[PDB]
Design a protein around this ligand. Structure first.
Ligand SMILES: NC(=O)C1=CN([C@@H]2O[C@H](COP(=O)(O)OP(=O)(O)OC[C@H]3O[C@@H](n4cnc5c(N)ncnc54)[C@H](OP(=O)(O)O)[C@@H]3O)[C@@H](O)[C@H]2O)C=CC1
Ligand SMILES: NC(=O)C1=CN([C@@H]2O[C@H](COP(=O)(O)OP(=O)(O)OC[C@H]3O[C@@H](n4cnc5c(N)ncnc54)[C@H](OP(=O)(O)O)[C@@H]3O)[C@@H](O)[C@H]2O)C=CC1
Ligand SMILES: COc1cc([C@H]2OC[C@H]3[C@@H]2CO[C@@H]3c2ccc(O)c(OC)c2)ccc1O
Ligand SMILES: COc1cc([C@H]2OC[C@H]3[C@@H]2CO[C@@H]3c2ccc(O)c(OC)c2)ccc1O
Lengths: 286, 284
């Protein structure tokens, strides 16, 4: 009745699935976009339909069909998108929101490095949102803990090393490690918060701002074993998949080289979210 | 303490993940084989580690490393395999079980058509050559692959206006929720009555023709679907076609009756299996 109605686009994605449940947890009437099947994909289908059992609704639409996008967004108050990074497909979604005219806010697929400090398709999407006058919130500023914490920031894996661990530089650059659930919960709390309309929200829970060497030492403290570390210089690091992102995060320190005010930081805006600290996050791997 | 210890091989698969949960839900001390990551795969890793929260344990081993397989299966009493249907990777698992010597039962990756009427039969023969006690769980169509799409190909959800009927669609088929298959598997793996037996998962009310399946749906929706009957030869004129043919034209799942002592729903009458009118409700 007084629920905010939210449409989640990219609902079976890594972040999308968590945003779906977090909107439900917060009591929003939650709608998930159901795209036509491109394959026989049991996992995707069963995930989408498990949302119905939790109280969500599915709306079939296709980005190839402008009027199906328009009809979907007319049923909701707020749209959140979490596409792969696929980003530019949101342009069709923005066009639909503009025509529909009823959307109180649009959260596009961000949830990572703020692209507007990396001087790119996310900015192209931002520019379209703002040219159309669609109220927005941009959620940025955090490494997914699954991609950067559980592996102690090693590449090619998602679990803790047995023995050996590479340290980028001296491992003294501060990075922001956040459990994707908490990013999704922050997103669900912020999407109808009058304080964040037309703002960028930084997800930087204070106790989770850690250097890589700090994260490794949380883990060494849990296992009681010191890992053999070898440090990698910037030049040697600079000597395909994702190596750039890693450089900005761990050498340039792009996630922590600016300060953020409490009126734009998720953990201060939403203090009741007991976000997962990395000593608790890493326990699953013991 | 008195619990059966079970190693699930294939724990992150469609059937395997349900067997993991169904084993924990039975009270089995449950182990899951953790294979080396072949890629950055976040849904697979997180599924694996979610099992620990429910009480399961992870055992690392690799099929390339015979001794790591022997080491894994020494830690359990029973192994259940649910590999991709790869099936032959189980031959390494059989040699490992044979050398280990401690395993009371092995349930190989079956969960469908009876291959004894094939890679699966080769696994069977190696299991039996090695004298490893076994149970073969067979005889049903996964409901997600065959019921939710009304047995249409290339989709997993109901069609909106038209549907292909195979023949006249009056060949009987066995549609079963994968969770029920997993529950029957978890109940049967330490059941004395099914040692060295085939167990047929043929819940009585879910033995249905494709047309009876379609009519279940039309009745839930109140909408009649436009039907096109496809004859045997026009079908004998793409993955999975041989399977649909044996299921839907020859009735290979239902042409032989099965005794109560070997049919899952009678062995375990406490399993309130999902009937297809309830299964299809989630699509409405
Ligand atoms: N450390 C960090 O901060 C991280 C940041 N991110 C960012 O989070 C956001 C989501 O990333 P992630 O959660 O990993 O996304 P995914 O790879 O999980 O895919 C998400 C959804 O994208 C939809 N999708 C993919 N291609 C298309 C397409 N051509 N047309 C329509 N829909 C498509 C699908 O929606 P559907 O479910 O409907 O099929 C897919 O389910 C991204 O912006 C990413 O840049 C993610 C990784 C780490
Ligand atoms: N309608 C029916 O009756 C159905 C019957 N089946 C049968 O179910 C059984 C399982 O099918 P399904 O659930 O679809 O299996 P999956 O496709 O989901 O994969 C299961 C597991 O196979 C392991 N795997 C795949 N390749 C390898 C490999 N080279 N080496 C080691 N492990 C590998 C992986 O285990 P891991 O988690 O460790 O990574 C994978 O998780 C099969 O026998 C299949 O015939 C399946 C579909 C329908
Ligand atoms: C932190 O913000 C982001 C990070 C990322 C990616 O940075 C590289 C990481 C993460 C997604 O997964 C990338 C990755 C790529 C290759 C890898 O080997 C890897 O670690 C296994 C991780 C993408 C978008 C973002 O907004
Ligand atoms: C029913 O027994 C089995 C069925 C199957 C597969 O037969 C074809 C079916 C099912 C798995 O999904 C296959 C399938 C293949 C192509 C399709 O287009 C399809 O659409 C649902 C479904 C494999 C192993 C079995 O033991």
């Amino acid at each position: 009745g007084e629920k905010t109605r939210v449409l989640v686009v990219g609902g079976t994605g890594t972040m999308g699935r968590r945003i779906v449940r977090a909107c439900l947890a917060e009591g929003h009437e939650t709608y998930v976009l159901q795209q036509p099947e491109t394959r026989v994909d049991i996992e995707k289908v069963q995930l989408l339909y498990s949302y119905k059992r939790l109280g969500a609704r599915l709306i079939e639409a296709s980005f190839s069909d402008h009027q199906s996008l328009v009809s979907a967004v007319k049923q909701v108050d707020i749209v959140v998108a979490a596409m792969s990074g696929s980003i530019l497909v949101q342009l069709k979604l923005v066009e639909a929101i503009k025509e529909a005219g009823n959307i109180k806010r649009f959260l596009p697929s961000e949830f990572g490095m703020d692209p507007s400090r990396m001087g790119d398709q996310k900015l192209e999407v931002r520019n379209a949102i703002e040219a159309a006058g669609i109220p927005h919130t941009y959620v940025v500023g955090a490494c997914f803990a699954a991609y950067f914490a559980g592996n102690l920031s090693q590449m090619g894996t998602l679990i803790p090393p047995k023995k050996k661990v590479n340290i980028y530089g001296d491992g003294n650059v501060k990075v922001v490690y956040v459990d994707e659930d908490d990013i999704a919960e922050y997103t669900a709390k912020t999407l109808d918060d009058p304080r964040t309309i037309n703002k960028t929200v930084y997800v930087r829970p204070t106790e989770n701002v850690l250097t890589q060497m700090e994260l490794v030492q949380i883990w060494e403290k849990l296992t009681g074993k010191e890992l053999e570390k070898t440090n990698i210089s910037a030049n040697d690091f600079l000597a395909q998949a994702g190596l750039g992102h890693f450089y900005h995060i761990f050498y340039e320190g792009c996630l922590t080289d600016h300060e953020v005010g409490d009126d734009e930081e998720a953990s201060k805006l939403y203090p009741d979210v007991k976000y997962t600290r990395m000593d608790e996050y890493l326990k699953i791997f013991l």
